[PDB]
Design a protein around this nucleic acid. Structure first.
Lengths: 192, 324, 1062
DNA sequence: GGCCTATCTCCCAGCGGTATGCACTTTTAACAGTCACCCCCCAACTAACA
DNA sequence: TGTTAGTTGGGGGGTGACTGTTAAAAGTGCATACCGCCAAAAGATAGGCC
């Protein structure tokens, strides 16, 4: 079992407790409205709420904070050092993974062109739907066998398509590199 | 400094150090008798006393009060500290050399593998205990100075603050030091008796202390003194850890405790031009261990496993230039 | 594939739409900064009116007019680093990075407080050099928003900005009436502002448009001094015969070119002075092992350097300090060559981390200064000034009127060579630490040197080992033993010097200012001072320039002297040094010698390394003339800047150096050389000159066999106290005797004139002590008188008067007293000494004798030190009074936070670098954290033990320096070359009488002035008469006005004394 | 009274690791509906890195 | 010459970004004290700082 999943639940904030209370009511009243608009309206209503009632609602947050402190103290007393090390390793791996997807989304959002697909990839993209077998893996194996059975004369068109794709990739890469040099993204520039 | 004026501890300590009194070789060597009631207590119990009194006063009193009995004082003006002076020793009335104390008694020499030849009792100094332990340790590992002959028993009193760091184990993170490794490695230590400060009488160079305020001030700390018995292990000196190459091991212990919150891998990389992982899984341990989590015996294990790899000539990266 | 292309194209269109939305998004948002890198230019200001113009006068040439409209309206370590960052970003063209850091530090609240006015003015001038109006307006917006009032240089940058980019606008220097309203005059813009000359030219272009009738103030010739002691040298209506060098214009010009190439290369290589090694297979293996010698590590250093610069640049963009411009100052080639040359000559014992860092930082700074001077075009200006300067002091050239080199250098057009002050100590420490870390981590070698097939592992070249002594440890870089074996295995060319260490080949730069002098391009400070302390330079520049004039001229007189190497002398030294050296006579044997053995090997290797360096520099500089610069210390004493071949060295050094220009001997020629050789024998000290000359005539056969066949002869010259100088002098006199006419022989040999116990001589002059004026030779008498034998004979009276009773005194002291045991304490009474140290000295002296009871050393030392101090008190009376008064004054000034200060009669002021140990500062880092002490902190309190012990020896040395300077300046007029070791004066053998005459004359003229009285008046005007506290005015005013009263001694009689300085 | 030290300048050399506290900005998550993104399987090539 | 890797089209499913308002745990940088006594004779001499 996951060590992080066995941790006690975090204390619910008063604003989020109010939002969770009012979410089904607003969902039933406005089913066709988007959730973002409903959350914004709930937050606007919370802004209309005075802070005195926020303090009265946060008194229970203080009490449940004391309860959660006692629970996490008992859980930490029940944790072995091996479990603590495993939890720390899991937290570090989760943080590294989160930074990895953050960097991947940052690189994808900037508009980096994809790698130039070969003629085999072009044939797979063109003829995947017209392949025998219900399973996608069977379709992929059938298309790969068909590509192996193809002759060079039929492959010449796919080689030309791959050449045009490589030229388009080179043009987009040059434009992308010029735009990053305009903003000085020297780390994103290719060494070769 | 420290002297006893109570007959109860005198008799109890005489029975403790009595044990088996059948000692045809040299029997007792008291570090500093002082008033000498412990000397007459040991003569009463059937044990000889050889008073190595450091102070030039009270020398004739012991011999005048002890020559008439069959048990002889044989008082010699020396101390159990301040012996074998190097870069000096032409003139020395307080201090005195090593062979002079033994040609006056006739011990001569025995090999290390024999039984226990002598027995030395007394005090450590109030301050500078670490310097005394270092001098004793260098005399022990060098097979020179006092311990040139076979062995010794050096039962003394030591303070509690230095007793806590005198031996430690894997764990005890605040107090694991170099001397803790050295003193367990060299000798086996047993504790014998416990003493308070108030029983001992505070003494000065001119005479006994006459100030009640000073002795009450020193007694309000109440450090619990500890009777400790060093006995040298028979096979301490081996083919890998020789008495000519011990200073490299002292360097290893001083450097390896130099950065306390660290790993064995980094210190061994800085010390030897060898792959430290090979040595660490050769002795049986893993990579990510910390230096405050090893036995004292593990240090000798690591040090002796280094040397037998004779394929590589350059192995230690330590010379006399590092002494400075 | 088609629909995939369509959907990817649509997604790409949404991606550029999001990118354009991010461009519309302001740079203050964290997401737009994190996703896309950029440097921010538009400032953010936390005020309503400034934000109002932010929207208004950026939505809009009003920005041209705003540049003139805005004109109408104890430093911590981080502050020093930021100021150095901006000043370094001025010189390299990276102004956007400086603007980025400035606006980022203005954005956050805590970093705003670090910024001071000069930090704005630097980047203001930097943007003014390119002539952009709107960014000047932005920086002035920042200045006015921060509450800092603008300064004169800030307005200068604005006027320079309107001056360039000529638009012929009417409103150039618009609202200079506002400059008048704030109170700034336009004449202070041209002078006393640190901007360059081109800035003055452009601001002059800007200033003439409004007011055509505007001219510079007329210049005036430099004033001469009217001080009493310095009047005669700087005076009119005088007939002067000034000296001139022997070699012509062409030799000087060629040697100037050679020295410029030597200094621009910044490194010299020296041939090996030892024997060559026999070729073998292993010799060829180690010779061809150059594949790993630099090529496997130069690329690694380039990689590490580029990666470090990229990392430091991306840390620059993220609002933090960095060493990026400090590492982009110098090119990659020379900054790698620095590490490659530092890695050479590594001993087996290594060195500490801090020493290596301190070396690397200074080595970087020197190359930075010389390369910047190369780029800016001051080298050609220096050449075209030096060619016309060298018309003076040339044998083939003449002058309209004769004058000193400094006045002729000022009479020509001003060179205007201004150099920047060195970096503060934290930046030097960090840069040296970074370079040391890069060296220790980049260089790694395969450990399989003996057999490549044995293993494949990469080991470090330098290990971090701890060295423990007492309680403490220290970090040490230890080379691997295989590299040490490789270095000392096969071949040792292994010699490389800097450009500062080797002596010059051209006449030195005259000391025009405390900034300029000594070497032509490389920097050298006027006062030798520990690193970080800078109060000496502030005191030397705060004073009027005229007061230092003669002092600087004295230094120039000590720099124009010409020196050659005597090959005949060091032929024998090389013959002994290459073979098995004899440790007798100073030549070191090799440590091969065929606990204590290791100490002997360490000492012998330490001596032999300096022997290698000195003899290699001797063989390289053979048959070539070399000239030495000089500088002045903390007190005033002078030493040559090269530390290897200074003539203030041993005895084997002074056996080699010999003058270049020559003088003929004449009537009184060879008598002085004969007396000199008897003086250098040391056998016959206490006789008059006639007996020394008779003794010299007695031993002519000894002299000739000591000279004509020196090697394997009767070996007379070894018995002298100073053997090699005796051999050189005997060679010169043997050559001089065998002549047709001995009067016409050309002399190149200096003659020592020396004062025995010069400190007591100056004390007896100050106190007018009649009894002490005979013990040291300050009175006319026929025989010389020594103070050592006087003390050793006066203690005998006390010995007999005590041991007539017959205590343990008669066992030792009535048997064994002599002047050899009381020589050291009478040598060192002028310096600091006490009864403890003197007791140790005579204890060693007593235990040195083999025939002596060792049981009675201890009490005899006590008795002897007591009687020696009693005898010295009896002989010298005013000396102890002056020492006590000086110590009391230093103590009473050091109780308050006041370092003692005094002014020499020649005009030089002196401070003292004694303060308590500051809060030490540690640099956090990867491999190791190192600590240092910052000497520039004025906040730390004075050390009142190192000042009370140290004022009395320093005052006497100051007076010694003044007397030497006076006799140098007065020997220059009459045509005499003067070289001084401290209290050791050298001229040619012909002109010793004229030196002695003006030496006594200048001594009487110097000590005729009330030195103690003017010191008391100066220390009453300064450090007193203040309402700060009452105890100071009660104690210092009483103590400092009390001076020791003089005795009854006629000072003019020194003019007829034959043994003062003889 | 108790204690610490011892001779000025130049040359060379001139200590580190670790625990705790203070001031402050920066995430950050408190929780949840909804929508694409990515981890991985079905086998490969060339672009890139070393 | 040896080592990684991205999509190529489906398919199951946790998960970051989009919407959110407000207090609040934690990293950064800096300073400071304690230890780190790897040793080594005292025979006693002053005298001023603490």
């Amino acid at each position: 079992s996951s060590v992080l999943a066995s941790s006690p639940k975090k204390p619910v904030s008063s604003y989020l407790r109010f939002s969770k209370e009012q979410l089904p009511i607003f969902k039933a009243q406005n089913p066709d409205a988007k959730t973002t608009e409903l959350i914004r309206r709930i937050a606007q209503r919370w802004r209309e709420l005075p802070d005195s009632k926020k303090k009265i609602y946060q008194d229970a947050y203080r009490a449940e904070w004391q309860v959660y402190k006692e629970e996490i103290s008992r859980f930490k007393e029940q944790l072995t050092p091996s479990q603590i090390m495993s939890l720390e390793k899991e937290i570090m791996d989760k943080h590294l993974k989160r930074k990895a997807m953050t960097k991947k989304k940052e690189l994808t959002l900037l508009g980096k062109p994809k790698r130039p697909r070969s003629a085999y990839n072009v044939y797979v993209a063109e003829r995947f739907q017209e392949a025998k077998g219900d399973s996608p893996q069977e379709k992929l194996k059938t298309v790969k066998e068909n590509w192996k059975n193809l002759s060079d004369s039929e492959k010449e068109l796919y080689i030309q398509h791959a050449k045009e794709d490589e030229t388009r990739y080179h043009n987009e890469m040059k434009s992308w590199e010029e735009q990053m040099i305009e903003v000085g993204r020297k780390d994103l520039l290719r060494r070769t | 400094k420290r002297y006893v004026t109570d007959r109860r501890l005198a008799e109890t300590l005489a029975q403790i150090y009595l044990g088996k009194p059948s000692r045809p070789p040299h029997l007792l060597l008291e570090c500093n008798p002082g008033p000498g009631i412990l000397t007459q207590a040991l003569l009463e119990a059937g044990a000889k006393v050889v008073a190595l009194e450091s102070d030039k006063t009270f020398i004739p009193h012991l011999e005048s009060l002890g020559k008439n009995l069959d048990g002889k004082l044989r008082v010699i003006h020396c101390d159990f500290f301040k012996l074998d002076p190097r870069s000096g020793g032409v003139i020395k009335p307080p201090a005195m050399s090593s062979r002079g104390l033994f040609k006056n008694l006739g011990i001569e020499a025995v090999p290390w593998t024999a039984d226990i030849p002598l027995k030395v009792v007394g005090m450590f100094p109030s301050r500078g205990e670490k310097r005394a332990l270092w001098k004793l340790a260098y005399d022990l590992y060098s097979c020179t100075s006092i311990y040139k002959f076979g062995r010794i028993e050096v039962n003394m009193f030591i303070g509690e603050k230095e007793f806590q760091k005198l031996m430690a184990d894997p764990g005890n993170p605040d107090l694991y030091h170099v001397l803790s490794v050295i003193w367990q490695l060299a000798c086996e230590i047993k504790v014998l008796h416990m003493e308070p400060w108030s029983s001992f009488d505070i003494y000065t160079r001119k005479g006994p202390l006459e100030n009640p305020k000073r002795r009450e001030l020193l007694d309000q700390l109440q450090q619990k003194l500890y009777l400790i018995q060093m006995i040298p292990r028979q096979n301490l000196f081996t083919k890998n850890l020789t008495p000519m190459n011990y200073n490299i091991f002292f360097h290893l212990l001083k450097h390896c405790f130099g950065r306390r919150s660290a790993t064995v891998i980094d210190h061994l990389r800085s010390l030897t031009p060898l792959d430290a992982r090979d040595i660490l899984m050769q002795i049986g341990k893993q990579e990510d261990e910390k230096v405050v989590n090893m036995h004292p015996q593990d240090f000798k294990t690591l040090f002796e496993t280094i040397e037998r790899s004779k394929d590589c000539a350059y192995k230690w990266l330590y010379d006399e230039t590092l002494e400075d | 594939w088609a629909k995939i292309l369509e959907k990817d194209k649509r997604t790409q269109q949404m991606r550029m739409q999001r990118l354009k939305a991010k461009l519309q998004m302001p740079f203050q948002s964290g997401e737009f900064k994190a996703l896309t890198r950029r440097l921010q230019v538009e400032p953010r200001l936390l005020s309503k009116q400034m934000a109002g113009c932010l929207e208004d006068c950026t939505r809009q040439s009003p920005w041209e007019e705003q540049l003139a409209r805005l004109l109408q309206e104890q430093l911590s370590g981080q502050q020093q680093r930021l100021l150095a960052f901006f000043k370094c970003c001025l010189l390299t063209d990276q102004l956007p990075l400086a603007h980025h850091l400035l606006v980022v530090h203005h954005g956050q609240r805590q970093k705003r407080k670090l910024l001071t006015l000069d930090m704005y003015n630097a980047v203001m001038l930097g943007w003014a050099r390119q002539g952009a109006f709107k960014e000047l307006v932005y920086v002035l917006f920042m200045v006015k928003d921060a509450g800092l009032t603008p300064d004169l240089l800030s307005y200068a940058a604005a006027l320079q900005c309107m001056g360039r980019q000529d638009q012929d606008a009417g409103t150039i220097e618009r609202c200079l009436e506002q400059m008048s309203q704030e109170g700034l005059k336009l004449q202070a813009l041209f002078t006393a502002v640190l901007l360059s000359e081109e800035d003055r030219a452009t601001v002059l272009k800007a200033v003439h448009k409004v007011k055509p009738t505007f001219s510079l103030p007329p210049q005036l010739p430099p004033p001469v001094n009217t001080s009493k002691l310095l009047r005669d040298v700087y005076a009119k209506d005088g007939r002067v015969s000034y000296p001139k060098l022997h070699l012509p214009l062409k030799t000087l010009q060629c040697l100037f070119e050679k020295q410029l190439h030597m200094e621009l290369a910044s490194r010299v290589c020296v041939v090996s002075v030892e024997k060559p090694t026999l070729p073998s297979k292993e010799v060829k293996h180690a010779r061809k092992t150059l594949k790993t010698l630099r090529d496997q590590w130069e690329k690694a250093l380039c990689r590490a350097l580029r990666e470090t610069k990229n990392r430091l640049e991306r840390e620059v963009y993220e609002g933090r300090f960095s060493l990026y411009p400090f590492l982009c100052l110098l090119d990659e080639r020379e900054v790698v060559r620095m590490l490659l040359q530092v890695l050479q000559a590594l001993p087996a014992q290594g060195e500490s981390f801090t020493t290596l860092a301190r070396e690397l930082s200074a080595r970087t700074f020197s190359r930075h200064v010389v390369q910047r001077q190369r780029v800016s075009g001051q080298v050609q200006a220096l050449q075209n000034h030096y060619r016309k300067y060298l018309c003076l002091l040339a044998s083939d050239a003449e002058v309209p009127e004769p004058c000193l080199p400094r006045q002729y250098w000022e009479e020509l057009g001003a060179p205007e060579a201004l150099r920047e002050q060195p970096w503060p100590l934290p930046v030097q420490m960090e840069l040296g630490k970074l370079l040391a870390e890069m060296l220790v981590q980049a260089t790694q070698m395969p450990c399989s040197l003996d057999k490549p097939h044995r293993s494949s592992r990469l080991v470090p070249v330098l290990y971090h080992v701890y060295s423990f002594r007492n309680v403490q440890q220290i970090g040490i870089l230890k080379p691997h033993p295989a590299y040490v074996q490789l270095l000392e295995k096969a071949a040792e060319p292994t010699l490389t010097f800097e450009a500062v260490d080797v002596p010059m080949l051209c006449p030195p730069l005259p000391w025009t200012s405390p900034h300029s002098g000594a070497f032509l391009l490389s920097p050298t400070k006027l006062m030798r001072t520990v690193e970080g302390a800078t109060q000496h330079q502030e005191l030397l520049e705060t004073c009027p320039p005229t007061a230092l004039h003669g002092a600087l001229d004295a230094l120039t007189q000590l720099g124009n002297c010409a020196w050659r190497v005597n090959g005949r002398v060091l032929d024998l030294v090389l013959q002994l040094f290459q073979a098995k050296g004899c440790p007798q006579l100073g030549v070191p044997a090799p440590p091969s010698e065929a606990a204590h053995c290791q100490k002997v090997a360490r000492e012998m290797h330490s001596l032999r390394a300096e022997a290698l360096y000195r003899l290699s520099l001797a063989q390289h500089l053979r048959d070539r003339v070399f000239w030495l610069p000089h500088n002045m210390d903390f007190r005033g004493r002078t030493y040559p800047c090269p530390p290897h071949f200074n003539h203030l060295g041993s005895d084997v050094a002074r056996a080699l150096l010999e003058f270049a220009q020559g003088r003929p001997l004449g009537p009184h020629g060879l008598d002085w050389l004969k007396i000199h050789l008897v003086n250098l024998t040391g056998l016959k000290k206490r006789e008059p000159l006639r007996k020394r000359l008779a003794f010299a005539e007695e031993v002519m056969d000894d002299i000739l066999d000591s000279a004509d066949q020196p090697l394997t002869g009767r070996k007379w010259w070894m018995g002298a106290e100073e053997p090699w100088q005796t051999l050189a002098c005997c060679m010169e006199v043997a050559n001089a005797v065998r002549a047709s006419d001995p009067a016409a022989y050309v002399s190149h040999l200096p003659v020592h004139q020396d004062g025995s116990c010069n400190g007591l001589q100056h004390y007896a002059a100050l106190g007018r002590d009649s009894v002490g004026a005979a013990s040291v030779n300050l009175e006319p008498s026929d025989v010389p008188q020594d103070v050592y034998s006087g003390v050793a004979a006066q203690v005998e009276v006390f010995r007999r008067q005590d041991a007539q009773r017959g205590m343990r005194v008669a066992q030792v002291l009535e048997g064994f007293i002599t002047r050899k045991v009381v020589k050291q304490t009478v040598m060192t009474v002028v310096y600091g000494v006490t009864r403890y140290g003197g007791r140790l000295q005579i204890e060693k002296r007593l235990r040195e004798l083999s025939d002596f009871p060792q049981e009675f050393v201890w009490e005899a030392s006590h008795y002897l030190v007591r009687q020696v101090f009693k005898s010295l008190q009896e002989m010298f009376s005013g000396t102890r009074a002056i020492q006590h008064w000086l110590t009391e004054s230093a103590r009473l000034i050091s109780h308050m936070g006041s370092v003692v200060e005094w002014v020499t009669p020649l005009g030089v002021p002196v401070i003292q670098p004694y303060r308590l140990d500051s809060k030490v500062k540690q640099i956090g880092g990867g491999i190791q954290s190192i600590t240092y002490t910052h000497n520039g902190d004025i906040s730390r309190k004075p050390n009142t033990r190192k000042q009370k012990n140290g004022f009395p020896p320093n005052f006497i040395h100051s007076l010694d320096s003044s007397h030497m300077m006076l006799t140098a300046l007065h020997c220059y007029r009459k045509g005499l070359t003067f070289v001084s070791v401290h209290d050791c004066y050298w001229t040619h053998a012909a002109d010793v009488s004229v030196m002695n005459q003006v030496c006594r004359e200048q001594f009487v003229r110097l000590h005729s002035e009330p030195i103690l009285q003017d010191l008391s008046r100066f220390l009453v005007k300064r450090f007193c008469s203040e309402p700060q506290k009452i105890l100071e005015a009660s104690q210092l005013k009483e103590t400092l006005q009390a001076v020791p009263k003089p005795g009854a001694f006629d000072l003019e009689q020194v003019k007829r004394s034959t043994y003062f300085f003889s």
